[PDB]
Structure 1
Amino acid sequence: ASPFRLASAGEISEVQGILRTAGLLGPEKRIAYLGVLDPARGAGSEAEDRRFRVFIHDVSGARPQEVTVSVTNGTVISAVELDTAATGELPVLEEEFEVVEQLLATDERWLKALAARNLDVSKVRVAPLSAGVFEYAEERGRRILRGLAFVQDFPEDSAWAHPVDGLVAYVDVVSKEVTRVIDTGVFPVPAEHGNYTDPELTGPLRTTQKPISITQPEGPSFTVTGGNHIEWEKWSLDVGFDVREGVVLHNIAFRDGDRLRPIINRASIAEMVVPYGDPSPIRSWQNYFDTGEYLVGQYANSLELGCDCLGDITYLSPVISDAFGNPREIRNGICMHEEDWGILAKHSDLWSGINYTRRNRRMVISFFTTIGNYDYGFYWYLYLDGTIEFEAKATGVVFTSAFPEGGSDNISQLAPGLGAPFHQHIFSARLDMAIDGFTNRVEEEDVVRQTMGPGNERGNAFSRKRTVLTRESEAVREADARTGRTWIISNPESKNRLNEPVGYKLHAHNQPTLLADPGSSIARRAAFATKDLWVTRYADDERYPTGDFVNQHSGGAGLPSYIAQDRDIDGQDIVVWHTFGLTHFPRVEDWPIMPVDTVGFKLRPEGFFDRSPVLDVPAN
């Protein structure tokens, strides 16, 4: 009955039938995106209408379409033809990945380049990568992928150990034409293998690890109702899944006494970009928008009990559409469980004689995605004390190149002749805030140092200052770790028992933002990544920081265009967009498979409650 329930296989099959009967899903059509639309603001009329948004690609070259369908009423609501030279191309299709390698295998320029290197074309894998927008006028309005080559010595070989540097090709995947093959010179193909399950490389496996057994004899403390509604230790929320964004959290609220208090209306990772910092023309165009260009949800892994998720695990298996509109289940794609989290609070008091210890726990909601060589885990945590935290875990195999003789300022050496170009992994969290309701405001809080003098005669005082962000034009903010800068989202019309506005404080990790020159193509296309914090006024159609159609978009879409409206955000329905990321200079220890590294952010209550919210936790 909940409007926030997961899409069902029956809903997707109905969408397919509605599109087919409307003439919109002939044999030349492919579904490049399909997802359920959130309820519009103020759905208090109970008039449920399950609507789906669909991007439809045409493999014959006809214009793609954006279509909205009502499953409830069985109708097409709107259907718009897209001019992709203007508004951007549709996301990459999984079926286009194979096209790149197959087309190059018959191109005479590609074969000549491989022949010069004495490489068997049957052993050459081609990584199909998004194209971006650069100097090539012939690419405007065409669907282009760029290919980089790696050698697979045998079917179980890790091709990433054997990059073919000095060679790149561009492919038009609709007309099936190789537009350019660029060969800048022969580099030796690195020869050592990177097969991390080969006993020759691992040595004998350790026999020293004894088992750790995590069980819950009475079952977990959370309940799941309606397929995806979670109640756990006073928290309440709905777990959504979208093929572009992945796990989305809706209606995060906290039961404070007999009052269910909203905190966040919708939380998601709305974009993630991986820009490379190697100026070689072989790779200087390389920037992945895993969310916007590839759709991270559709590559979600099935998670294995005992390996990927350990403990008493509750799974969700979300349903997505394939390219023909058939439902496809991602079995065990989301893991849910609680974890012990050490000491929550502790005091031993000399005067009262009371010794007091309580333990903490967190609720974990997670999924993993794999796009090419990288694997990313997305973890949302809810804690007993009201803290909300996000953590991204990056692992997999680093993207490789040759290591040039005489070194490089932009590439790490991992093995003889084997390099790994510098890059970043940058995320955008979109937080549709609802602190005690929708009238919210953001303040920037800095530490204030004070000079020794009158009123501060011993020179020990320090303070803080808060600046309200009143309009979108002043709401583009940068981190300042040295002044302890944080941001508070408060509700000026809802006060705690001390007559102060209730709030939550955003704590960032203060990692570097986008490093590229501000005049670069990537700085224009990923403008969100150049600043740590943006605040916008809520609008139905302002969903992604990079715009709706990221693939081969020339730039400026998304947040820079939204904030030009200069809307009032002082005590209004607002959205916080937080940029955070990892700057990765690969180390030898990252090879041949990378140990996890992490980045994230958290929000902690700031006078939201009238006292500690965990006084009623028992001693266990």
Structure 2
Amino acid sequence: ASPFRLASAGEISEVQGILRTAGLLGPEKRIAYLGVLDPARGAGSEAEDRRFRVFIHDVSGARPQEVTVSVTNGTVISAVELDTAATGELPVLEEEFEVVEQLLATDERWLKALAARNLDVSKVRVAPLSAGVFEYAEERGRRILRGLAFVQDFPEDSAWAHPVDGLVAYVDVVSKEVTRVIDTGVFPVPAEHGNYTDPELTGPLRTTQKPISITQPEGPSFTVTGGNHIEWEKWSLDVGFDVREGVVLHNIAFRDGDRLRPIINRASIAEMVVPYGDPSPIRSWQNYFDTGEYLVGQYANSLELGCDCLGDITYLSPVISDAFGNPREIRNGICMHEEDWGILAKHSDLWSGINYTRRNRRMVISFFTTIGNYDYGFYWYLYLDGTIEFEAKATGVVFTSAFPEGGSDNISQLAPGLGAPFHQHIFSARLDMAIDGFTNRVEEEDVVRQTMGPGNERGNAFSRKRTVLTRESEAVREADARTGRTWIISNPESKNRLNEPVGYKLHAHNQPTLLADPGSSIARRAAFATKDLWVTRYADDERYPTGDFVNQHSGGAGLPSYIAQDRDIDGQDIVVWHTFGLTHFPRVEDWPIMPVDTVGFKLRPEGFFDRSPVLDVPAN
């Protein structure tokens, strides 16, 4: 009965039928995005209406359309034709990936380049990569993919070990034309294989690891109701899934005595960009928007018990649409479980004689996606003490190139002749805040050093200062680790028992933001990534930090255009957008398959409760 329930297979089938009967889903049409719309603000009238947003691509060259459908009422609410040279192209379709390699295999320029290198065309895999927007006037308004080549010596070979450097092609995937083939010179194809299951590379497998058995003999402590409503250790929330964003958390609330207290209305990773820092023209255009261009949710893995998720696991299997409107289940795509998390609180008191220890635990909600060579795990954690944490885990195989003799300032060497270009992995968390309700504000908190002198005669004092962000034009903030800078989201109309506004503190990891020159194409298209924190006034249509149509958009969409409205954010319905990421200079140890590296953020209560919220946790 919940309006936040997961989309069902029947709902997706109904959308398909509604679109087809409306004449909007003929043989030339493809669904590039389909997802459920959240309830509008103030749905406290039970006026339940399940609406879906659909992006419809046309493979014959006709204008694409954005369509909204009500499955409740069985009607098309609106259908708009899109001018893609203006507002951006639709996300890449899975079926366009194969088109790139197939088209290049019959192009005389491509074949001549492979012949010069003595490569058999049947062994050459082509990575189909998003195009961005650069200097090529003929690409405006066309759907372009760019291809980089790798050699597969045999069907089970890791092609990433054998990049074909000095060669790139651009393909129009609608007209099926190869627009440009660029060959800047012959590089040796690195010859060592990178097959991490080959016994000659692994050596004999270890026999020293003894099993670790994690079980819950009475079952887990959380309950799942309505398909996706979670209750666990005073937390309450709904787990959503969207094909673009992946796992979305709705209605995060905490049961404080008799009150269910809201904290976060909606939490998601709303964009992620992987910009490459190699100035070679073979790769200098390379920037993945995994969320906005490719849709990370549709490439979610089925997670295996005992390998991907260990313990007493509860799975959700979300349903998405394929390109024709048929429902497709991602079996075991979301793992949920609780984990022991060490000591929660401990004290041995000499004067009272009391020894006290309690253990911590966390609830884990996770999924994994694979886009080409990289694999990413997205982890949301809820802790007993009110902390909320996000962690991204990056693994997979690094993107490779030739390593030029005489070295490089922008590429690491991984193996003889084998390079890995420098890059970043940057995420944007969109946190539609609801600290004790919707009247919230953000304060920036800095440590304050004090000078020795009157009123501080021993020079030991230090303090802190808080600055309220009152309008969007002043709410674009940078980290400052040296001053211990954090941000507090508070509710000025809800006070704790000390008459102070209740709040939550955002702790960032303070990693570098986007490194590209601010005049670059990527800085314009990923402007969110140039600053650590943005605060906007909530609006229904301001969903993504990069805009709705990221693929081949010329720039400026999303957060820079939203904040130009300069709206009041002091005690209002607000959204926090936090940029965080990893700067990856690949190491030899990242090859031939990369051990996990992590990055994230957390929010801790700051006078939200009237005392520690875990005094009622029992012993042993």
TM range (shorter): over 0.9
Residue 185 of structure 1: aligned partner: 185
* Alignment deviations for residues 545-573 of structure 1 (CA, whole Å, 9 cap, x no partner): 00000000000000000000000000000
Q: Distance in 1 between matches of 2:361 and 2:274?
A: 33
Question: Is residue 381 of structure 2 the alignment partner of residue 389 of structure 1?
Answer: no
What is the TM-score when the length of structure 1 is the normalising length? 1.00
Aligned-residue offset at 1:233: 0.0
What is the TM-score when the length of structure 2 is the normalising length? 1.00
Aligned-residue offset at 1:350: 0.1
Q: Secondary structure of 2:99's match?
A: helix
Q: Secondary structure of 1:536's match?
A: strand
* Alignment deviations for residues 237-288 of structure 1 (CA, whole Å, 9 cap, x no partner): 0000000000000000000000000000000000000000000000000000
Stretches of structure 1 that go unaligned for 5 or more consecutive residues are: none
Q: Secondary structure of 1:20's match?
A: helix
Aligned-residue offset at 1:327: 0.0
Residue 80 of structure 2: aligned partner: 80
Aligned-residue offset at 1:18: 0.1
Aligned-residue offset at 1:122: 0.0
Residue 425 of structure 1: aligned partner: 425
* Alignment deviations for residues 475-509 of structure 1 (CA, whole Å, 9 cap, x no partner): 00000000000000000000000000000000000
Q: Distance in 1 between matches of 2:470 and 2:321?
A: 42
Q: Distance in 2 between matches of 1:435 and 1:307?
A: 37
Q: Distance in 2 between matches of 1:136 and 1:18?
A: 39
Residue 465 of structure 1: aligned partner: 465
Aligned-residue offset at 1:108: 0.1
Q: Distance in 1 between matches of 2:211 and 2:402?
A: 41
Aligned-residue offset at 1:473: 0.1
Residue 41 of structure 1: aligned partner: 41
Q: Distance in 2 between matches of 1:496 and 1:171?
A: 60
Q: Distance in 2 between matches of 1:446 and 1:187?
A: 52
Q: Secondary structure of 2:53's match?
A: strand
Stretches of structure 2 that go unaligned for 5 or more consecutive residues are: none
Aligned-residue offset at 1:590: 0.0
Q: Distance in 1 between matches of 2:423 and 2:468?
A: 35
* Alignment deviations for residues 72-123 of structure 1 (CA, whole Å, 9 cap, x no partner): 0000000000000000000000000000000000000000000000000000
Q: Distance in 2 between matches of 1:251 and 1:44?
A: 14
Q: Distance in 2 between matches of 1:99 and 1:350?
A: 73
Aligned-residue offset at 1:575: 0.0
Aligned-residue offset at 1:524: 0.0
Q: Distance in 2 between matches of 1:495 and 1:335?
A: 36
Q: Secondary structure of 1:97's match?
A: helix
Aligned-residue offset at 1:582: 0.0
Residue 499 of structure 1: aligned partner: 499
Count of paired positions: 620
Q: Distance in 1 between matches of 2:441 and 2:47?
A: 30
Q: Distance in 1 between matches of 2:128 and 2:300?
A: 19
Q: Distance in 1 between matches of 2:45 and 2:491?
A: 25
Q: Distance in 2 between matches of 1:209 and 1:517?
A: 48
Q: Distance in 2 between matches of 1:492 and 1:405?
A: 61
Aligned-residue offset at 1:408: 0.0
Aligned-residue offset at 1:201: 0.0
Aligned-residue offset at 1:213: 0.0
- What's the RMSD between the two structures over aligned residues? 0.1
* Alignment deviations for residues 3-50 of structure 1 (CA, whole Å, 9 cap, x no partner): 000000000000000000000000000000000000000001101000
* Alignment deviations for residues 422-481 of structure 1 (CA, whole Å, 9 cap, x no partner): 000000000000000000000000000000000000000000000000000000000000
Q: Secondary structure of 1:280's match?
A: coil
Aligned-residue offset at 1:306: 0.1
Aligned-residue offset at 1:147: 0.0
Q: Distance in 2 between matches of 1:246 and 1:470?
A: 32
Q: Secondary structure of 1:293's match?
A: helix
Q: Distance in 1 between matches of 2:132 and 2:46?
A: 43
* Alignment deviations for residues 350-372 of structure 1 (CA, whole Å, 9 cap, x no partner): 00000000000000000000000
Question: Is residue 142 of structure 2 the alignment partner of residue 142 of structure 1?
Answer: yes
Q: Distance in 2 between matches of 1:183 and 1:48?
A: 57
Residue 522 of structure 2: aligned partner: 522
* Alignment deviations for residues 316-366 of structure 1 (CA, whole Å, 9 cap, x no partner): 000000000000000000000000000000000000000000000000000
Tell me the percent identity: 100
Q: Distance in 2 between matches of 1:315 and 1:552?
A: 36
Aligned-residue offset at 1:67: 0.1
Aligned-residue offset at 1:417: 0.0
Q: Secondary structure of 2:16's match?
A: helix
Aligned-residue offset at 1:62: 0.0
Residue 295 of structure 2: aligned partner: 295
Aligned-residue offset at 1:71: 0.1
